[PDB]
Every structure is written in C-alpha cells, then in structure tokens.
Amino acid sequence: SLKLISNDLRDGDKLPHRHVFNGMGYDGDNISPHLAWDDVPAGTKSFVVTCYDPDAPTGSGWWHWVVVNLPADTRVLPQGFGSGLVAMPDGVLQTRTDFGKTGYDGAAPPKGETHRYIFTVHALDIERIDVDEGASGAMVGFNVHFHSLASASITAMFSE
C-alpha cells in the first residue's frame, strides 16, 4: 500500500524546529519538510499533499499547506518545496491555507497546547482537480474525498 516517509520527520515524533513557524511568537525556520512516497495504487493520475492540525481551536482545525495536481510520476517533495526554494513543476499548484496565502507555514500552537501536525499524501484517480490558487483546504478536501485511491500520513507532535 501507499507509504509516506520523510528524511526530516518520523511518525509520532516531535516536529523539528526547522519546520516550526517563524512568527506568532515562535522562531522556527518555517521550511516545509522533505516527503517521499512509494507503492502507488494502479490508476493513480495525480497526488495532493497537505499539512493539517486537527487540534487548532477554531471549530475546523487549521490547514497549514496544500499542494495539488502533482503529476502521476511524483514520488518526492524536496525540503522547502512549499517555502519558495524551488520553482513549481508545470501544472502543480499550491492552494490557499488558513494563513490566507499559499505555500507552507509551520506549527505555532497556543500557549500550553500540544497539537498534531498531520502530513498526508493522497493518490487520486484524476489528472487535475479543477481549482485555482484561491481554493480553500476544505474545497481541495472535497475533491480529494471523491477521487482518492489511497492515502498515507506522518503525524508530528508540537507543543508550547
């Protein structure tokens, strides 16, 4: 089955400071973590990668990063892919996060809280989801829900 791994994170471990937000009282490097996947289901035509915190106290969690329309041959996202280190491959789109912009912005939980930061890769059965960069994480999620063949995730914990 689809497997997601990372050179930076380890499922269940504390999110390294390199991926923590650089503002809101924090001083992390704010760099998106490397992600890599294997064993993709037959019929996969594209992938969606997201970072979500289900514990943010907002009534709907918090989308930290949303990448859509990665081509069928994608098997990796280098560190900093969502931080402006690299130009986007043709057709790939980073959509809108709860930070009101596109791209990766890291963890920045409230005082005394410990939250889960879930990185997920979804293999879809369609080549392109029809959204533009203003699409919200829920709008991308609705598309993923109807087109997902498989998903795999890594969860990092972060507190303070």
mmCIF file with all atom_site columns, N, CA and C in Angstrom, residues 66-102:
data_model
loop_
_atom_site.group_PDB
_atom_site.id
_atom_site.type_symbol
_atom_site.label_atom_id
_atom_site.label_alt_id
_atom_site.label_comp_id
_atom_site.label_asym_id
_atom_site.label_entity_id
_atom_site.label_seq_id
_atom_site.pdbx_PDB_ins_code
_atom_site.Cartn_x
_atom_site.Cartn_y
_atom_site.Cartn_z
_atom_site.occupancy
_atom_site.B_iso_or_equiv
_atom_site.pdbx_formal_charge
_atom_site.auth_seq_id
_atom_site.auth_comp_id
_atom_site.auth_asym_id
_atom_site.auth_atom_id
_atom_site.pdbx_PDB_model_num
ATOM 1   N N  . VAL A 1 66  ? -1.152 23.157 1.318   1.00 0.00 ? 66  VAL A N  1
ATOM 2   C CA . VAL A 1 66  ? -1.981 22.312 0.428   1.00 0.00 ? 66  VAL A CA 1
ATOM 3   C C  . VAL A 1 66  ? -1.326 22.353 -0.968  1.00 0.00 ? 66  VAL A C  1
ATOM 4   N N  . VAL A 1 67  ? -0.927 21.208 -1.499  1.00 0.00 ? 67  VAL A N  1
ATOM 5   C CA . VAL A 1 67  ? -0.286 21.122 -2.821  1.00 0.00 ? 67  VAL A CA 1
ATOM 6   C C  . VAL A 1 67  ? -1.143 20.206 -3.692  1.00 0.00 ? 67  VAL A C  1
ATOM 7   N N  . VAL A 1 68  ? -1.544 20.661 -4.889  1.00 0.00 ? 68  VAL A N  1
ATOM 8   C CA . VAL A 1 68  ? -2.409 19.816 -5.697  1.00 0.00 ? 68  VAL A CA 1
ATOM 9   C C  . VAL A 1 68  ? -1.837 19.675 -7.120  1.00 0.00 ? 68  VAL A C  1
ATOM 10  N N  . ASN A 1 69  ? -2.389 18.673 -7.804  1.00 0.00 ? 69  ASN A N  1
ATOM 11  C CA . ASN A 1 69  ? -2.019 18.430 -9.205  1.00 0.00 ? 69  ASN A CA 1
ATOM 12  C C  . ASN A 1 69  ? -0.584 18.034 -9.411  1.00 0.00 ? 69  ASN A C  1
ATOM 13  N N  . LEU A 1 70  ? 0.010  17.351 -8.405  1.00 0.00 ? 70  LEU A N  1
ATOM 14  C CA . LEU A 1 70  ? 1.370  16.815 -8.602  1.00 0.00 ? 70  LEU A CA 1
ATOM 15  C C  . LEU A 1 70  ? 1.190  15.693 -9.638  1.00 0.00 ? 70  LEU A C  1
ATOM 16  N N  . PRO A 1 71  ? 2.034  15.628 -10.650 1.00 0.00 ? 71  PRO A N  1
ATOM 17  C CA . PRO A 1 71  ? 1.846  14.610 -11.697 1.00 0.00 ? 71  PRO A CA 1
ATOM 18  C C  . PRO A 1 71  ? 1.963  13.201 -11.190 1.00 0.00 ? 71  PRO A C  1
ATOM 19  N N  . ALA A 1 72  ? 1.421  12.224 -11.956 1.00 0.00 ? 72  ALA A N  1
ATOM 20  C CA . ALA A 1 72  ? 1.430  10.828 -11.592 1.00 0.00 ? 72  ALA A CA 1
ATOM 21  C C  . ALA A 1 72  ? 2.790  10.219 -11.304 1.00 0.00 ? 72  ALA A C  1
ATOM 22  N N  . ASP A 1 73  ? 3.869  10.751 -11.841 1.00 0.00 ? 73  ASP A N  1
ATOM 23  C CA . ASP A 1 73  ? 5.196  10.232 -11.629 1.00 0.00 ? 73  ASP A CA 1
ATOM 24  C C  . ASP A 1 73  ? 5.864  10.876 -10.398 1.00 0.00 ? 73  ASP A C  1
ATOM 25  N N  . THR A 1 74  ? 5.094  11.671 -9.629  1.00 0.00 ? 74  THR A N  1
ATOM 26  C CA . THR A 1 74  ? 5.785  12.276 -8.448  1.00 0.00 ? 74  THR A CA 1
ATOM 27  C C  . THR A 1 74  ? 5.990  11.279 -7.340  1.00 0.00 ? 74  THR A C  1
ATOM 28  N N  . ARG A 1 75  ? 7.173  11.254 -6.701  1.00 0.00 ? 75  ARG A N  1
ATOM 29  C CA . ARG A 1 75  ? 7.461  10.339 -5.613  1.00 0.00 ? 75  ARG A CA 1
ATOM 30  C C  . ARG A 1 75  ? 8.211  11.096 -4.488  1.00 0.00 ? 75  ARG A C  1
ATOM 31  N N  . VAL A 1 76  ? 8.325  12.415 -4.658  1.00 0.00 ? 76  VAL A N  1
ATOM 32  C CA . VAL A 1 76  ? 9.068  13.161 -3.601  1.00 0.00 ? 76  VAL A CA 1
ATOM 33  C C  . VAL A 1 76  ? 8.761  14.641 -3.686  1.00 0.00 ? 76  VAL A C  1
ATOM 34  N N  . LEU A 1 77  ? 8.940  15.326 -2.553  1.00 0.00 ? 77  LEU A N  1
ATOM 35  C CA . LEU A 1 77  ? 8.823  16.766 -2.459  1.00 0.00 ? 77  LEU A CA 1
ATOM 36  C C  . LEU A 1 77  ? 10.106 17.128 -1.655  1.00 0.00 ? 77  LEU A C  1
ATOM 37  N N  . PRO A 1 78  ? 11.089 17.736 -2.258  1.00 0.00 ? 78  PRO A N  1
ATOM 38  C CA . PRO A 1 78  ? 12.301 18.094 -1.514  1.00 0.00 ? 78  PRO A CA 1
ATOM 39  C C  . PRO A 1 78  ? 11.953 19.030 -0.361  1.00 0.00 ? 78  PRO A C  1
ATOM 40  N N  . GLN A 1 79  ? 12.844 19.073 0.640   1.00 0.00 ? 79  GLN A N  1
ATOM 41  C CA . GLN A 1 79  ? 12.606 20.012 1.749   1.00 0.00 ? 79  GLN A CA 1
ATOM 42  C C  . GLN A 1 79  ? 12.555 21.419 1.180   1.00 0.00 ? 79  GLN A C  1
ATOM 43  N N  . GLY A 1 80  ? 11.595 22.235 1.647   1.00 0.00 ? 80  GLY A N  1
ATOM 44  C CA . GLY A 1 80  ? 11.480 23.604 1.180   1.00 0.00 ? 80  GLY A CA 1
ATOM 45  C C  . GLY A 1 80  ? 10.661 23.752 -0.102  1.00 0.00 ? 80  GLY A C  1
ATOM 46  N N  . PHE A 1 81  ? 10.047 22.678 -0.586  1.00 0.00 ? 81  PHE A N  1
ATOM 47  C CA . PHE A 1 81  ? 9.200  22.785 -1.795  1.00 0.00 ? 81  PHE A CA 1
ATOM 48  C C  . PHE A 1 81  ? 8.085  23.799 -1.571  1.00 0.00 ? 81  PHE A C  1
ATOM 49  N N  . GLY A 1 82  ? 7.526  23.867 -0.338  1.00 0.00 ? 82  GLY A N  1
ATOM 50  C CA . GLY A 1 82  ? 6.451  24.815 -0.070  1.00 0.00 ? 82  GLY A CA 1
ATOM 51  C C  . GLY A 1 82  ? 6.956  26.105 0.582   1.00 0.00 ? 82  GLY A C  1
ATOM 52  N N  . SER A 1 83  ? 8.246  26.370 0.430   1.00 0.00 ? 83  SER A N  1
ATOM 53  C CA . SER A 1 83  ? 8.849  27.545 1.071   1.00 0.00 ? 83  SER A CA 1
ATOM 54  C C  . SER A 1 83  ? 9.597  28.438 0.117   1.00 0.00 ? 83  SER A C  1
ATOM 55  N N  . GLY A 1 84  ? 9.350  28.259 -1.181  1.00 0.00 ? 84  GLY A N  1
ATOM 56  C CA . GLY A 1 84  ? 9.973  29.066 -2.202  1.00 0.00 ? 84  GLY A CA 1
ATOM 57  C C  . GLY A 1 84  ? 11.397 28.691 -2.554  1.00 0.00 ? 84  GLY A C  1
ATOM 58  N N  . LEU A 1 85  ? 11.880 27.516 -2.196  1.00 0.00 ? 85  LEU A N  1
ATOM 59  C CA . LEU A 1 85  ? 13.246 27.141 -2.531  1.00 0.00 ? 85  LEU A CA 1
ATOM 60  C C  . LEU A 1 85  ? 13.307 26.720 -4.001  1.00 0.00 ? 85  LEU A C  1
ATOM 61  N N  . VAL A 1 86  ? 12.218 26.128 -4.481  1.00 0.00 ? 86  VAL A N  1
ATOM 62  C CA . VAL A 1 86  ? 12.147 25.648 -5.858  1.00 0.00 ? 86  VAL A CA 1
ATOM 63  C C  . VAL A 1 86  ? 11.002 26.201 -6.681  1.00 0.00 ? 86  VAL A C  1
ATOM 64  N N  . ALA A 1 87  ? 11.208 26.246 -8.021  1.00 0.00 ? 87  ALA A N  1
ATOM 65  C CA . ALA A 1 87  ? 10.094 26.690 -8.879  1.00 0.00 ? 87  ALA A CA 1
ATOM 66  C C  . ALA A 1 87  ? 9.110  25.515 -8.960  1.00 0.00 ? 87  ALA A C  1
ATOM 67  N N  . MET A 1 88  ? 7.831  25.802 -9.132  1.00 0.00 ? 88  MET A N  1
ATOM 68  C CA . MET A 1 88  ? 6.845  24.726 -9.217  1.00 0.00 ? 88  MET A CA 1
ATOM 69  C C  . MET A 1 88  ? 6.941  23.970 -10.539 1.00 0.00 ? 88  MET A C  1
ATOM 70  N N  . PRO A 1 89  ? 6.852  22.658 -10.514 1.00 0.00 ? 89  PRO A N  1
ATOM 71  C CA . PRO A 1 89  ? 6.846  21.889 -11.758 1.00 0.00 ? 89  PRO A CA 1
ATOM 72  C C  . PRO A 1 89  ? 5.594  22.286 -12.529 1.00 0.00 ? 89  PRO A C  1
ATOM 73  N N  . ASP A 1 90  ? 5.605  22.186 -13.861 1.00 0.00 ? 90  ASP A N  1
ATOM 74  C CA . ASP A 1 90  ? 4.427  22.568 -14.637 1.00 0.00 ? 90  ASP A CA 1
ATOM 75  C C  . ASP A 1 90  ? 3.140  21.923 -14.155 1.00 0.00 ? 90  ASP A C  1
ATOM 76  N N  . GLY A 1 91  ? 2.057  22.679 -14.033 1.00 0.00 ? 91  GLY A N  1
ATOM 77  C CA . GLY A 1 91  ? 0.751  22.201 -13.641 1.00 0.00 ? 91  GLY A CA 1
ATOM 78  C C  . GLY A 1 91  ? 0.520  22.034 -12.139 1.00 0.00 ? 91  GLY A C  1
ATOM 79  N N  . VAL A 1 92  ? 1.570  22.088 -11.357 1.00 0.00 ? 92  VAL A N  1
ATOM 80  C CA . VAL A 1 92  ? 1.438  21.921 -9.894  1.00 0.00 ? 92  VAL A CA 1
ATOM 81  C C  . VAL A 1 92  ? 0.940  23.243 -9.320  1.00 0.00 ? 92  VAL A C  1
ATOM 82  N N  . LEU A 1 93  ? 0.086  23.160 -8.303  1.00 0.00 ? 93  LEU A N  1
ATOM 83  C CA . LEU A 1 93  ? -0.457 24.369 -7.719  1.00 0.00 ? 93  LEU A CA 1
ATOM 84  C C  . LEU A 1 93  ? -0.443 24.308 -6.178  1.00 0.00 ? 93  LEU A C  1
ATOM 85  N N  . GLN A 1 94  ? 0.031  25.378 -5.542  1.00 0.00 ? 94  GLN A N  1
ATOM 86  C CA . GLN A 1 94  ? -0.089 25.391 -4.060  1.00 0.00 ? 94  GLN A CA 1
ATOM 87  C C  . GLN A 1 94  ? -1.329 26.251 -3.813  1.00 0.00 ? 94  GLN A C  1
ATOM 88  N N  . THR A 1 95  ? -2.312 25.715 -3.116  1.00 0.00 ? 95  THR A N  1
ATOM 89  C CA . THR A 1 95  ? -3.576 26.421 -2.909  1.00 0.00 ? 95  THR A CA 1
ATOM 90  C C  . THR A 1 95  ? -3.649 27.120 -1.560  1.00 0.00 ? 95  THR A C  1
ATOM 91  N N  . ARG A 1 96  ? -4.787 27.729 -1.267  1.00 0.00 ? 96  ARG A N  1
ATOM 92  C CA . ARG A 1 96  ? -4.904 28.576 -0.075  1.00 0.00 ? 96  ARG A CA 1
ATOM 93  C C  . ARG A 1 96  ? -4.964 27.837 1.247   1.00 0.00 ? 96  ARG A C  1
ATOM 94  N N  . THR A 1 97  ? -4.198 28.360 2.213   1.00 0.00 ? 97  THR A N  1
ATOM 95  C CA . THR A 1 97  ? -4.178 27.737 3.539   1.00 0.00 ? 97  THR A CA 1
ATOM 96  C C  . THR A 1 97  ? -4.962 28.630 4.510   1.00 0.00 ? 97  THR A C  1
ATOM 97  N N  . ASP A 1 98  ? -5.061 28.195 5.776   1.00 0.00 ? 98  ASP A N  1
ATOM 98  C CA . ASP A 1 98  ? -5.795 29.050 6.750   1.00 0.00 ? 98  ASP A CA 1
ATOM 99  C C  . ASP A 1 98  ? -4.999 30.285 7.101   1.00 0.00 ? 98  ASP A C  1
ATOM 100 N N  . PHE A 1 99  ? -3.730 30.367 6.666   1.00 0.00 ? 99  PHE A N  1
ATOM 101 C CA . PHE A 1 99  ? -2.926 31.564 6.877   1.00 0.00 ? 99  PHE A CA 1
ATOM 102 C C  . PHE A 1 99  ? -3.328 32.648 5.862   1.00 0.00 ? 99  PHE A C  1
ATOM 103 N N  . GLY A 1 100 ? -4.241 32.333 4.947   1.00 0.00 ? 100 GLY A N  1
ATOM 104 C CA . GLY A 1 100 ? -4.727 33.290 3.954   1.00 0.00 ? 100 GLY A CA 1
ATOM 105 C C  . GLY A 1 100 ? -3.747 33.511 2.815   1.00 0.00 ? 100 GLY A C  1
ATOM 106 N N  . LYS A 1 101 ? -2.932 32.523 2.509   1.00 0.00 ? 101 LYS A N  1
ATOM 107 C CA . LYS A 1 101 ? -1.933 32.636 1.440   1.00 0.00 ? 101 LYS A CA 1
ATOM 108 C C  . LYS A 1 101 ? -1.643 31.198 0.988   1.00 0.00 ? 101 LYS A C  1
ATOM 109 N N  . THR A 1 102 ? -0.726 31.050 0.034   1.00 0.00 ? 102 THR A N  1
ATOM 110 C CA . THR A 1 102 ? -0.417 29.692 -0.433  1.00 0.00 ? 102 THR A CA 1
ATOM 111 C C  . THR A 1 102 ? 0.980  29.327 0.068   1.00 0.00 ? 102 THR A C  1
#
